[PDB]
Structure 1
Amino acid sequence: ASPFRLASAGEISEVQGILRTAGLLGPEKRIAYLGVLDPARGAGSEAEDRRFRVFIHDVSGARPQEVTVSVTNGTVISAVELDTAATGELPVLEEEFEVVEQLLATDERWLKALAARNLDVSKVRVAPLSAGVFEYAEERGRRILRGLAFVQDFPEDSAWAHPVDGLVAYVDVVSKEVTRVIDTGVFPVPAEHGNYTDPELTGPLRTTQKPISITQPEGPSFTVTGGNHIEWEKWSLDVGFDVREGVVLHNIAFRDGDRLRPIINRASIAEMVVPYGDPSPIRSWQNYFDTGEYLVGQYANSLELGCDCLGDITYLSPVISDAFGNPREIRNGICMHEEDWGILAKHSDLWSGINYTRRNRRMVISFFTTIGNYDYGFYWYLYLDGTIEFEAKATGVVFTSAFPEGGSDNISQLAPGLGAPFHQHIFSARLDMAIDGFTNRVEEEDVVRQTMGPGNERGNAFSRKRTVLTRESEAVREADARTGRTWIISNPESKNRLNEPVGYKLHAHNQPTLLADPGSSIARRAAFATKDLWVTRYADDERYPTGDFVNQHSGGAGLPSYIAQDRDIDGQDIVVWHTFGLTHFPRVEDWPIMPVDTVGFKLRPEGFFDRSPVLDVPAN
């Protein structure tokens, strides 16, 4: 049908079948990751060769393996044994989070820690956080997780309101042993509850809200064919889904007259880091790689009609694989609908007497993911005028700590005795560019100010400078809001009627990048977050900014290594990597449940079309 179609339950089963028949899926193997591979560069090869990539964990202690399978031919294409102590461990497993509370419950030094605090073990919940690479040399090669405790007064209580400070415990999940229990001191456990559902806290619910009914009596303007192909207002694309990256967009093209023009080949949020700014030994190791370590698409929520998505909604229910190879369906995990977006263009002309007004619309493709305390919304927008935008919505419950008596320079106080450490939410978007084809280049555009004098008189002139990025070694860029720095991706071999290269301009929000000291562990492991834009030559194996195995890997694996190749990017098949995020100094208004905050970027046509592409929109 289409080589970009969503993986079916049948295919997941066939992989389990092929892995089983080839002796790779024994009773002790666990699938840490499984996802389809994208078709190869060279769409000339006719015939579907639907391949999958599988990361197989081993519970007895044996070396894990990276396996590639071809469901079409029913064979295993390759299988490599992995040296995790070198290339990094595999993604964490759902079944492993549950082991850290169980193991520590019967640990003598943990129980002694809780006794000194008069805390009942049946009420202590332990949060299984990923472990970076720090001092501890005995963790190398071993699959570790770290726990932090939160007291839950009753089954429906928000344990986040009761952090147990001064206590951390490392645990080896494979051999199932607690490697350490560190107790720096006793901190009072914040007693105030944080139950945003308790009528005591909420007070009487407002009755002033009248309904806002959004419908489409004739149905949506977009069509879905082949399960995931979308056709909307001249736009064309395929909505894919990977258990690691979540929603992924393929073949984004625009129908310019009698021509389907490609813009972006593949787009996804390829990584996401949440570094913590608390210098305390109890949290200085805290860094979530939501995409790399936990796999974003795995924890996707099922969206509800009227609550999560309002209007005329069309859902997609992606198919994931559980740890044993059985197909698992995320029902209504993808929302799709069109939205009104105010005025698109308007002018009341005095001379002609013509009054013109046109409404704008955007299409929305979204999914939500929950990862421990936080929930994130991923939104992609396509507008009538050719603009493409991405938006991340951060919500959920802020990670808490104890607010030290003397106050703190790295923690916010949210209630009496309750703290919340400073952190960032950093995203990395992978944009496989196909601006009117694969011959693309990136130019950095700066505004330039002119001194009053020769050309200038009056001193009113100002210009713009554009330098082309030619080699990968000079494609690592920093933002500059003062000079209005932006980046244009063009195709030198495709020109508009004015005989100028077609292009698209990238507008960043210019928020701060990674604040962690340059020599820190997190700086090395998340080097991508230290710069706003990276451009690399395309390669099939260069998929993530942090590499393929992020969990407990030591650093350098992603972009810093790809970039060292110093490949030519002037008029080639390039990939743009945009770093963007939020610096969060939690405020009282964020407790007990955090209201949505947002970050993103957008891409607008820069001489792509011959004139305005929305001249043919009617007036409803």
Structure 2
Amino acid sequence: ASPFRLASAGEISEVQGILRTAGLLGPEKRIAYLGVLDPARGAGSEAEDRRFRVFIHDVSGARPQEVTVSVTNGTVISAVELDTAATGELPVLEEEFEVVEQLLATDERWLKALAARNLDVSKVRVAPLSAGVFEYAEERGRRILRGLAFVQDFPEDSAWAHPVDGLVAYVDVVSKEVTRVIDTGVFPVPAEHGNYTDPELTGPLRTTQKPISITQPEGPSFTVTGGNHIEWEKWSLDVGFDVREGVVLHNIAFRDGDRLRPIINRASIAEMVVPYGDPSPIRSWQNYFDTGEYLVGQYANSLELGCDCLGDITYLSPVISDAFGNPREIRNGICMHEEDWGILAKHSDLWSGINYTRRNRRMVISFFTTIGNYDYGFYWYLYLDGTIEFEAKATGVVFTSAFPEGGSDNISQLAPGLGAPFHQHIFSARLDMAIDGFTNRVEEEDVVRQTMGPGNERGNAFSRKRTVLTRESEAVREADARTGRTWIISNPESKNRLNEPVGYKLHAHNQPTLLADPGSSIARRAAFATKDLWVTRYADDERYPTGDFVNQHSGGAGLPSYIAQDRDIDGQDIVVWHTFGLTHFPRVEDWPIMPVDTVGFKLRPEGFFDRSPVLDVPANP
């Protein structure tokens, strides 16, 4: 059995049983995170050791625990009580969905605020908003959620149309107490509805769209074996799924002739955060770590055939644990399919008389998640030519506020009285590299302009420079779009037939990084987001750029701590962490439901192959 197979329902039940028998899962315990661990380095040989990591909350007020279990051997490997004021709180629990609203509904201060606004408490929705770390000393070591009110006029109404500005509250979800209710003043609650299925707002539906049918009469060109092992057009990989990260890719490799050549050992989105840029005290604390605080895999959607994924689709239905250790399937949570991708290569040669055209295609592995108002599609693509790409598709409903009567430098107007605070959506891709194996290095490549003069008398020359990042202290890099900056991951011990090291080049989109002041709480908690590229030496326990327990963790954790080790990364087992994101000034067109916008990155072979790897693609039928 592949050590990279998806977790099965029986493994999760086994973890439950092991924890129970060890005294670690009594009736007061709640599993906040559970996932299989990847195999250790050099473990390929041999014998199963499937281990699971578990974060266990306690509803009675006792300290939570981090536990690793061997499901293979039926044993607890390690169990440690956590001091959450030091190392962070556990991820938000599903069962907290309604707790903030419930607590607030019986609080006299909350009710006073609602009564001033003539709002029916039974119509007021409130979400479990993550709290971060600000100036409130009573919150240190306590599990806090914050709450913002949105009115639902009727049960199928979009509450996002009706934000209640000027009001925020903080609660403790263990003691079930409301710690603070803050009312800065009454803003009109926007009146118009945002019901995008109401014919009054949609108008008559278009009747002009004729069907576009995508079929594969012979079935798909990829195979799936062992549950999650993909073979497609020379590519080989395993599709993992983790409740925190979502879809993970393992063992990305390319079969070049008779050799299986590794490229990336593990690819994931290891963090994603949505920092808000509105200085109103109602929202200035808000930074949603969709991955680290909420767990994006947990909220993966079940994808509808013909709707979410069109064509000949092979689904995976990954299994996760509920809060009690029972397995729960996400039916049709991962789509896998190949897509036509236009022209691959084309040339019409006058001298030879040969006219040549070939088509491209890509393998797609995707999932979609919903976190509150946001919905995101995460797409990995493998192309015939060896290119690897990630794309995020951001949609949903925008997070709303009042639009201030005098206008705003930090909020845009969507509808009468309705605002959208500015924000970013910033991702970190963790790419545990294995270019032709684990001995890798990274070079920063810039274009080099040359001065007109001796050796360049016509002033046309230009060049390139590559700078090796030799130690972690040198490996925190920023974009430079003007100079075409990219980063090449190579294997200095593996040369192509031209005696040049094999490599892959990372092409970033060069979007803005974290805009917050560098002294802010968010700049400290999401330090990764302040720089485009980090390179670390691989270590088993360095998994997330924000650290293991993000919720209410004070600044400092993750990448900035890991690189202090100043380890050798010049021809070693290394990990690239690429920050990329969208900066969103919401437009009227984003209301009442947002069209998709996109961001991502790609890696292209750079002297990895001895010539084009797609010369054996046949002409299209």
Per the alignment, residue 506 of structure 2 pairs with 506
User: Do structure 1's residue 45 and structure 2's residue 11 form an aligned pair?
Assistant: no
Q: What CA deviation, in whole Å up to 9, does each residue of 1:424-476 have, x standing for no partner?
A: 00000000000000000000000000101111011100000101000100100
**1:56 alignment partner, SS class:** strand
Q: Distance in 2 between matches of 1:603 and 1:45?
A: 30
Q: Distance in 1 between matches of 2:546 and 2:128?
A: 22
Aligned-pair CA distance for 1:570: 0.2
Q: Distance in 2 between matches of 1:385 and 1:260?
A: 16
Q: Distance in 2 between matches of 1:66 and 1:212?
A: 50
Q: Distance in 1 between matches of 2:565 and 2:72?
A: 35
Aligned-pair CA distance for 1:165: 0.5
Per the alignment, residue 54 of structure 2 pairs with 54
Q: Distance in 2 between matches of 1:418 and 1:27?
A: 45
Give ranges in structure 1 of 5+ residues lacking alignment.
none
Q: Distance in 2 between matches of 1:169 and 1:479?
A: 39
CA contact (8 A) 2:98 2:126 kept: no
Q: Distance in 2 between matches of 1:101 and 1:280?
A: 22
Q: Distance in 1 between matches of 2:602 and 2:293?
A: 27
Per the alignment, residue 132 of structure 1 pairs with 132
CA contact (8 A) 2:229 2:237 kept: yes
Q: Which runs of 4+ in 1 moved over 6 A?
A: none
Q: Distance in 1 between matches of 2:118 and 2:43?
A: 65
CA contact (8 A) 1:50 1:72 kept: yes
**1:582 alignment partner, SS class:** strand
CA contact (8 A) 1:317 1:332 kept: yes
CA contact (8 A) 1:348 1:355 kept: yes
Q: Distance in 1 between matches of 2:494 and 2:51?
A: 33
Aligned-pair CA distance for 1:96: 1.1
Q: Distance in 2 between matches of 1:75 and 1:36?
A: 14
Q: What CA deviation, in whole Å up to 9, does each residue of 1:300-320 have, x standing for no partner?
A: 000000110000000000000
Q: What CA deviation, in whole Å up to 9, does each residue of 1:316-362 have, x standing for no partner?
A: 00000000000000000000000000000000000010000000000
TM-score (norm 1): 1.00
Q: What CA deviation, in whole Å up to 9, does each residue of 1:390-444 have, x standing for no partner?
A: 0000000000000011110000000111100000000000000000000000000
Aligned-pair CA distance for 1:97: 2.0
CA contact (8 A) 1:479 1:485 kept: yes
Per the alignment, residue 182 of structure 2 pairs with 182
Q: What CA deviation, in whole Å up to 9, does each residue of 1:181-211 have, x standing for no partner?
A: 0000000010000000000000000001000
User: Do structure 1's residue 217 and structure 2's residue 217 form an aligned pair?
Assistant: yes
**1:451 alignment partner, SS class:** coil
Q: Distance in 1 between matches of 2:407 and 2:482?
A: 35
Aligned-pair CA distance for 1:256: 0.3
Q: Distance in 2 between matches of 1:15 and 1:449?
A: 59
Q: Distance in 2 between matches of 1:139 and 1:65?
A: 20
Per the alignment, residue 531 of structure 1 pairs with 531
Per the alignment, residue 419 of structure 2 pairs with 419
CA contact (8 A) 1:145 1:173 kept: yes
Q: What CA deviation, in whole Å up to 9, does each residue of 1:213-256 have, x standing for no partner?
A: 00000000000000000000000000000000000000000000
Q: Distance in 2 between matches of 1:193 and 1:541?
A: 48
Q: Distance in 2 between matches of 1:8 and 1:415?
A: 47
Name the CA shift for 1:124/1:304 in 2 (closer, same or farther; >3 Å).
same
Q: What CA deviation, in whole Å up to 9, does each residue of 1:115-156 have, x standing for no partner?
A: 000000011111220000000000000000000000000010
**1:150 alignment partner, SS class:** strand
Per the alignment, residue 461 of structure 2 pairs with 461
Q: Distance in 1 between matches of 2:347 and 2:95?
A: 60
Q: Distance in 2 between matches of 1:411 and 1:29?
A: 42
Identical aligned pairs, as a percentage?
100
TM-score (norm 2): 1.00
Give ranges in structure 2 of 5+ residues lacking alignment.
none
Aligned-pair CA distance for 1:557: 1.0
CA contact (8 A) 1:146 1:171 kept: yes
CA contact (8 A) 1:125 1:150 kept: yes
Q: What CA deviation, in whole Å up to 9, does each residue of 1:164-193 have, x standing for no partner?
A: 000000000001000000000000010000
May I ask how many residue pairs the two structures share in their alignment? 620
Q: Distance in 2 between matches of 1:400 and 1:373?
A: 10
Per the alignment, residue 606 of structure 1 pairs with 606
CA contact (8 A) 2:98 2:127 kept: no
Name the CA shift for 1:154/1:44 in 2 (closer, same or farther; >3 Å).
closer
Q: Distance in 2 between matches of 1:277 and 1:311?
A: 40
**1:76 alignment partner, SS class:** strand
Aligned-pair CA distance for 1:43: 2.8
Aligned-pair CA distance for 1:45: 3.6
CA contact (8 A) 2:261 2:436 kept: yes
CA contact (8 A) 1:127 1:150 kept: no
Q: Distance in 2 between matches of 1:15 and 1:553?
A: 28
Q: Distance in 2 between matches of 1:484 and 1:500?
A: 22
Q: Distance in 1 between matches of 2:299 and 2:347?
A: 47
**2:565 alignment partner, SS class:** coil
Q: What CA deviation, in whole Å up to 9, does each residue of 1:61-110 have, x standing for no partner?
A: 00000000001111111101100000000001010121111111111110
Aligned-pair CA distance for 1:511: 0.3
What is the correspondence of 1:519-598 to structure 2 with a 5 Å cutoff? 519-598=519-598
CA contact (8 A) 2:69 2:78 kept: yes
Aligned-pair CA distance for 1:44: 4.6
